[PDB]
Design a protein around this nucleic acid. Structure first.
Ligand SMILES: [Cl-]
Ligand SMILES: [Cl-]
Ligand SMILES: [Cl-]
Ligand SMILES: [Cl-]
Ligand SMILES: [Cl-]
Ligand SMILES: [Cl-]
Ligand SMILES: [Cl-]
Ligand SMILES: [K+]
Ligand SMILES: [Mg+2]
Ligand SMILES: [Mg+2]
Ligand SMILES: [Mg+2]
Ligand SMILES: [Mg+2]
Ligand SMILES: [Mg+2]
Ligand SMILES: [Mg+2]
Ligand SMILES: [Mg+2]
Ligand SMILES: [Mg+2]
Ligand SMILES: [Mg+2]
Ligand SMILES: [Mg+2]
Ligand SMILES: [Mg+2]
Ligand SMILES: [Mg+2]
Ligand SMILES: [Mg+2]
Ligand SMILES: [Mg+2]
Ligand SMILES: [Mg+2]
Ligand SMILES: [Mg+2]
Ligand SMILES: [Mg+2]
Ligand SMILES: [Mg+2]
Ligand SMILES: [Mg+2]
Ligand SMILES: [Mg+2]
Ligand SMILES: [Mg+2]
Ligand SMILES: [Mg+2]
Ligand SMILES: [Mg+2]
Ligand SMILES: [Mg+2]
Ligand SMILES: [Mg+2]
Ligand code: NA
Ligand code: NA
Ligand code: NA
Ligand code: NA
Ligand code: NA
Ligand code: NA
Ligand code: NA
Ligand code: NA
Ligand code: NA
Ligand code: NA
Ligand code: NA
Ligand code: NA
Ligand code: NA
Ligand code: NA
Ligand code: NA
Ligand code: NA
Ligand code: NA
Ligand code: NA
Ligand code: NA
Ligand code: NA
Ligand code: NA
Lengths: 156, 142, 337, 172, 132
RNA sequence: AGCCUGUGUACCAGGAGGGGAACAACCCAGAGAUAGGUUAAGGUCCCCAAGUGUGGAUUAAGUGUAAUCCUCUGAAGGUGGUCUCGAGCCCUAGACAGCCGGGAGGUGAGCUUAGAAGCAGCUACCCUCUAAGAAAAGCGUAACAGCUUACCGGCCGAGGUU
RNA sequence: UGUCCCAACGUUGGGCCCGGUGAACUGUACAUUCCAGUGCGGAGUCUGGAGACACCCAGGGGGAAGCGAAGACCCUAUGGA
RNA sequence: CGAGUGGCUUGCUACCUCGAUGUCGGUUCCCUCCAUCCUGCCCGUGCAGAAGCGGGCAAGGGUGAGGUUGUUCGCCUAUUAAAGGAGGUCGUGAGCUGGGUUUAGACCGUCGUGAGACAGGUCGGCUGCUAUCUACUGGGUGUGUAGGUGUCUGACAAGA
RNA sequence: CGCCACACGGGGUAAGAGCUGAACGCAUCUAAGCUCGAAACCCACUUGGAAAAGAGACACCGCCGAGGUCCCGCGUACAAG
């Protein structure tokens, strides 16, 4: 099903698992990538910033993350960098799959609500921004237009 | 043949629409106007898109009909007609007291209306009505 | 699925209405190549027979062998260029400038024209030469007419008049050539313009059939099978879709059929003679006996027997001329039986 | 902006309206140099290309007019020449100059002669398996050379195997 | 193909039953299609003298029956015009079974054959008894 | 959804007149008759009342000349098309680019391997001449040769580069 | 074997013109329309354009959501049988 | 995984018509769209050639005949350059057909105590109207341009 | 169902192949300029066309007479006309 159906934040927040059952598991494999043993003790820190409030299905998160981290293997399976996707798909989403009668939909998935200007991804690298490329590929699989932002890094 | 024009306008190197707009205004004021050298009148823009528009007008039509002129002669006159309420008595009277000519059948040299002249030295994107008619298939009778 | 299929009849010969002149009017002329000369001639249709010819085609595996060919016999007596009309180029196309007439007129040209009793040939010629000096002279044509009285099989005496262009070397040269022909008496013949073996375009008003239905007029089908017995036999299915809610002129409908002008291209002139050699025993049905100047045209020619047909050197030939084909036999067998 | 081109002692360059003509011992070339607000004029010993605008599009044409004029200076003196080489693998290609167009026969065995018409006062002198296209108008010479090579263009089959044709060997 | 050197009015259609003028063991042939032919809406594909048609055997030896083969029309009842204007027509409609190379599948041809068929199918002609 | 169902409010319904091409609810506006005048929304090239108004800039697509909207689409993604503003670094001790010349030896390093010589793989990557020149960045060879990057010098002359 | 390919010609009665006889259906008004748009979302009539000299004869029926019938389908009625 | 375009399917909605806008399929006859099946001109190729595969421009023309089925669709056969798809009230019943859906008769299966029912099958089962306006195909009478004969011009219009 | 006839070639383009060429000293089919290049577009060819309201042109005849309608015999024409 197309993102057209769920990318907008026009519906009430729907996240109370005590009143919602049958919620599909998330497809997001990990949130901490790279050298998670080490702490952000890197020279450069780039972030992928969302430029519009939107809902991002756990579907897109996984594909976006994979496409970025799977690529960050331009540095190697045990390369020196740490990757972080800071958002989690809390918003439960429905579908009315009778016509408009008793239409309250059944749970079909989950999505994460991101407000314009928040960073969804944050990578930590030594002067070796292959990460800037890992993100050109990442904002490629999420609905919004995005800003690739570098923070600690005056090594231009 | 023989047209007592109170005003003889020279369209050579002038913006068709800006001339037409003035010739319209004047004919509705009771003036008899003659536009000379229509083939040398000009319209700004990208020749390719300009020609597409006029070509589309030629192709448009059906049994009821959409007679669109191909000669620089009529193109210009039809242009003026669009600036006149030609179906009203007053409008038709004005329109009928205006005639466009290929070249200049008069002795006098027409006058150049203000703000209608195009400077060829500072403009490259424009076309000649004559060129348009040639593209449309007209018979270069000028 | 509804299989595709070409529309019924051509949309290029309309409107299918009655022709304005029974005498054809060419709307095109050959190019000014060779020497100055009149670019056309006329005659009256008589009928058909066949002739045996020697394969003239250099590319035919049969070149040199006998060959039966259909021919339409057209009586082509001498005509008379009674005047030279001159056109001038203007911002509105060509327009007649003036005309140079003669004094020698065929006894019965006054059955059609108000023959000139007072004309100034020179003034006309002057005006034309001045025009030419100024370079405004458009092509040059001759006012021509036929002499039906020379053709017994044809009832009319009233001559048919038509303008035929003159194409030639230079404008000055052919202008002179024109005047020369006219001044004499304008008397000219098929020989002077065409040579047997050349290709000509023949124009003419087809045989009239009055009003006819879509089936005959446009080639639409007849109702088929069970549909043919319901009350509809020769009527089309419909006059069009719901929308556009109007009948389009492109739908095949009843109307005048026949009696239209047609210019049939590339007709080979098999022979140009004189006499009764081509006439059929008993006489050409509904026509009569031929015994005078004639032209044999390969194949068919538009129009019925007795109608005036016009000749013009082909304007778009496909083959090269193969002059004077050998005719080994001309059938004179009766056309009755 | 304004650029000044000192014309060579060997040459004379005149210009009325938007047309410039350059004459030298080798010939004469006339070109139209028309662009919004760019004036080209002959100031005695130097040709001047100037304009009151400096936008990218204007500078582009100014630079173009310059090389166009210098190219003319060169064409009326030293001249322009392109060198070509006819080549064939099985069928002896015959390249001849007949009239104002170069004709090529028996290309890849073809019965129908391939041809092209020469541009302007361009000389196409052919000697054996070598061709020399020359003239004072670089535009004309360049095209004539090109057209010759294009004339043997093949799309139907693999060019790597069917390499027959005439090619530009030396560019001026 | 090569000019037949004669004008033909196809006298056969898809579905027509014709005689097999050879000794292949097939007596009756049913026309199925005409080589290189394309008609028009509602028109029955037509075939006549000199055409190569696809066919099925309706009558004959068990082994030959039902087989879909190729053949060439050698005779037809409907007239044809020769260069000299004369018309020529036969007593029946007949075809001879042919192979990929156009060589008669059989050894002998039964009955006469039109000369025009020679200018197209040599081996078929050079196997003819009578060629009119 | 020109959907369904709440809520507050103004409007249509039952609201004219002005504008919006037309158009219940969008804008101005709430209206006795008649008359003069000035504005509102909106508009001032013609159709069409009033500007072919002024200072300046952008756009070359006829973009556009489309407040609102079922109604006027145009998106993610991309752009050495073009204009403007900033920051860093290099440059008349001559920068960037191009063209010309130089790109040297110990030495074809050692190792492995018949082989390997800048360039299959492994290790190392040293010092000489010098104004330059890798234990070789890319091609190429069976391996060589050959062709070039790095690096230096010249010609040139003004900004260049990120 | 004309059902078809694929239609043709002919015969008789009409049709067409003339004398005589002489209805009906239907009609808010206006009405020479066409292309688009708009509008209760399926306009000859609103808007913008285009086309358009009037009247008359014959034709085959594209449109007037053509004429004909207060929808038989479906639902509703504290209806009927 | 993400962003869209179309309005052919299906679904949703209930705005329009219940003082009726005649159904499906077919047929006949006309116009159109391009997201191109063939044809023209091209690019790439895992392009030797031949035969292909994929892509670009492009709607001029073509895209046919048959066997089963009411079928649309689809399956199948032989031909073919190819036998493309779609819109026009799912174009077309004041044009045709009436095989199917869906009246009243009847049978079978299933369900029901029964009347009788079925998103099951089956046999039979009707097609009204003289055109006022408009539209177009063709044919006339007048008026305007402003006496007559004859010959032309060509704004534009149609064609594959 | 029979028979005859129904181009080519110019011009301008698309996709594409290139030339000269700068922004950017080089390079570059493009930005200005140019050479080519589709069954497509325009012309060519066929048909209609003085009601084209700028309602046309030419030649001759005629304004007390040119010409035309009616009439009569007929059709290369035709449902009336
Ligand atoms: Cl039209
Ligand atoms: Cl008006
Ligand atoms: Cl410009
Ligand atoms: Cl039918
Ligand atoms: Cl078939
Ligand atoms: Cl109030
Ligand atoms: Cl525009
Ligand atoms: K209803
Ligand atoms: Mg019936
Ligand atoms: Mg006879
Ligand atoms: Mg006989
Ligand atoms: Mg090949
Ligand atoms: Mg059929
Ligand atoms: Mg109310
Ligand atoms: Mg005003
Ligand atoms: Mg626009
Ligand atoms: Mg908006
Ligand atoms: Mg209107
Ligand atoms: Mg009711
Ligand atoms: Mg009921
Ligand atoms: Mg009851
Ligand atoms: Mg109806
Ligand atoms: Mg396309
Ligand atoms: Mg078409
Ligand atoms: Mg329908
Ligand atoms: Mg249909
Ligand atoms: Mg109907
Ligand atoms: Mg009905
Ligand atoms: Mg009826
Ligand atoms: Mg039935
Ligand atoms: Mg049944
Ligand atoms: Mg039944
Ligand atoms: Mg009047
Ligand atoms: Na329900
Ligand atoms: Na995105
Ligand atoms: Na303009
Ligand atoms: Na038009
Ligand atoms: Na009936
Ligand atoms: Na009947
Ligand atoms: Na209908
Ligand atoms: Na109110
Ligand atoms: Na309004
Ligand atoms: Na626009
Ligand atoms: Na019959
Ligand atoms: Na109707
Ligand atoms: Na109703
Ligand atoms: Na139907
Ligand atoms: Na097409
Ligand atoms: Na079938
Ligand atoms: Na309908
Ligand atoms: Na019916
Ligand atoms: Na039907
Ligand atoms: Na062309
Ligand atoms: Na007139």
């Amino acid at each position: 099903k197309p993102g057209a159906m769920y990318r907008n934040s026009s519906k009430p927040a729907y996240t109370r698992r005590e009143y919602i059952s049958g919620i599909p598991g998330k497809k997001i494999a990990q949130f901490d990538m790279g050298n998670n043993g080490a702490g952000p003790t890197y020279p450069a820190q780039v972030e992928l910033v969302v430029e519009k409030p939107v809902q991002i299905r756990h579907n897109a998160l996984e594909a976006a993350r994979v496409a970025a981290n799977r690529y960050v293997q331009n540095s190697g399976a045990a390369a020196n960098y740490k990757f972080r996707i800071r958002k989690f798909p809390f918003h439960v989403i429905r579908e009315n799959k009778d016509g408009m009668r008793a239409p309250f939909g059944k749970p079909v998935g989950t999505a994460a609500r991101v407000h314009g200007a928040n960073h969804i991804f944050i990578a930590w690298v030594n002067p070796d921004p292959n990460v800037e490329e890992a993100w050109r590929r990442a904002k490629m699989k999420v609905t919004p237009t995005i800003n690739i932002d570098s923070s600690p890094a005056g090594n231009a | 043949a023989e047209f007592d024009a109170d005003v003889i306008v020279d369209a050579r190197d002038c913006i068709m629409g800006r001339v037409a707009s003035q010739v319209a205004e004047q004919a509705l004021d009771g003036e008899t106007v003659a536009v000379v050298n229509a083939e040398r009148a000009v319209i700004t823009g990208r020749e390719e898109q300009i020609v597409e528009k006029y070509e589309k007008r030629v192709d448009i039509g059906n049994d009821n009909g959409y007679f669109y002129p191909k000669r620089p002669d009529g193109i210009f006159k039809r242009t003026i007609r669009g600036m006149l309420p030609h179906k009203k008595q007053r409008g038709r009277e004005a329109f009928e007291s205006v005639r466009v000519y290929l070249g200049n059948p008069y002795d006098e040299d027409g006058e150049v209306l203000d703000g209608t002249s195009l400077d060829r030295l500072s403009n490259i994107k424009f076309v000649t009505l004559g060129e348009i008619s040639e593209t449309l298939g007209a018979n270069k009778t000028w | 699925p509804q299989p595709s299929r070409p529309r019924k009849g051509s949309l290029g010969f309309g409107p299918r209405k009655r022709s304005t002149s029974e005498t054809p009017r060419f709307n095109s002329w050959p190019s000014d190549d060779g020497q100055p000369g009149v670019q056309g001639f006329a005659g009256y249709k008589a009928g058909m027979t066949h002739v045996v010819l020697v394969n003239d085609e250099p590319n035919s595996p049969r070149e040199g062998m006998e060959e039966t060919v259909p021919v339409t016999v057209i009586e082509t007596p001498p005509m008379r260029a009674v005047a030279l009309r001159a056109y001038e180029d203007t911002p509105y196309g060509q327009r007649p400038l003036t005309e140079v007439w003669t004094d020698e007129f065929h006894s019965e040209l006054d059955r059609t024209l108000d023959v000139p009793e007072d004309h100034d040939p020179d003034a006309a010629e002057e005006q034309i030469r001045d025009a030419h000096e100024a370079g405004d002279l458009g092509d040059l044509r001759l006012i021509t007419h036929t002499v039906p009285d020379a053709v017994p099989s044809v009832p009319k005496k009233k001559p048919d008049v038509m303008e035929t262009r003159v194409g030639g070397g230079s404008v000055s040269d052919r202008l002179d050539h024109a005047l020369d022909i006219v001044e004499d008496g304008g008397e000219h013949a098929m020989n002077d313009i065409f040579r047997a073996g050349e290709y000509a375009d023949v124009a003419g008003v087809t045989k009239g059939k009055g009003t006819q239905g879509p089936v005959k007029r446009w080639g639409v089908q007849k109702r088929k099978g069970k549909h043919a017995r319901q009350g509809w036999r020769r009527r089309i299915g419909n006059l069009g879709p719901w929308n556009p809610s109007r009948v389009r002129s492109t739908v095949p409908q009843q109307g005048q059929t026949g009696y239209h002008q047609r210019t049939e291209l590339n007709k080979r002139l098999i022979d140009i003679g004189e006499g009764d050699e081509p006439t059929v025993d008993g006489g050409f049905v509904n026509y009569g006996e031929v015994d005078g100047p004639y032209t044999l045209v390969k194949g068919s020619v538009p129009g019925p027997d007795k109608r005036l047909v016009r000749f013009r050197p082909a304007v778009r030939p496909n083959d090269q001329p193969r002059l004077d084909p050998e005719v080994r036999y001309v059938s004179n067998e009766s056309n009755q039986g | 902006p304004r650029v000044e081109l000192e014309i060579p002692e060997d040459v004379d360059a005149e210009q009325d309206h938007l047309d410039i003509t350059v004459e030298g011992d080798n010939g004469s070339v006339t070109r139209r140099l028309w662009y919004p607000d760019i004036d080209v004029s002959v100031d005695g010993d130097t040709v001047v290309i100037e304009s009151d605008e400096d936008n990218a599009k204007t500078m582009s044409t100014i630079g173009t007019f310059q090389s166009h004029i210098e190219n003319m200076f060169h064409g009326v003196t030293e001249g322009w020449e392109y060198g070509m080489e006819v080549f064939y693998s099985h069928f002896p290609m015959q390249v001849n100059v007949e009239g104002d167009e170069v004709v090529i026969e028996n290309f890849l065995g073809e019965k129908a002669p391939r041809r092209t018409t020469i541009h302007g006062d361009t000389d196409v002198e052919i000697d054996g398996e070598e061709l020399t296209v020359s003239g004072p108008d670089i535009e004309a010479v360049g095209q004539t050379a090109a057209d010759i090579e294009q004339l043997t263009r093949i799309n139907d089959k693999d060019v790597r195997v069917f390499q027959d044709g005439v090619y530009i060997t030396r560019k001026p | 193909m090569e000019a037949l050197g004669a004008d033909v009015t196809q006298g056969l259609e898809k579905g027509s039953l014709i005689t097999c003028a050879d000794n292949t063991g097939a007596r009756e042939l049913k026309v199925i299609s005409v080589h290189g032919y394309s008609g028009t809406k509602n028109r029955h594909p037509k075939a006549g003298l000199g055409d190569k048609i696809t066919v099925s055997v309706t009558k004959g030896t068990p082994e030959m029956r039902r087989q879909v083969l190729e053949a060439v029309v050698v005779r037809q009842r409907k007239p044809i015009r020769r260069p000299d204007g004369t018309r020529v027509k036969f007593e029946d409609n007949a075809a001879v079974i042919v192979d990929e190379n156009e060589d008669p599948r059989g050894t002998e041809l039964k009955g006469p054959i039109a000369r025009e068929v020679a200018q197209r199918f040599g081996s078929v002609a050079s196997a003819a008894t009578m060629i009119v």
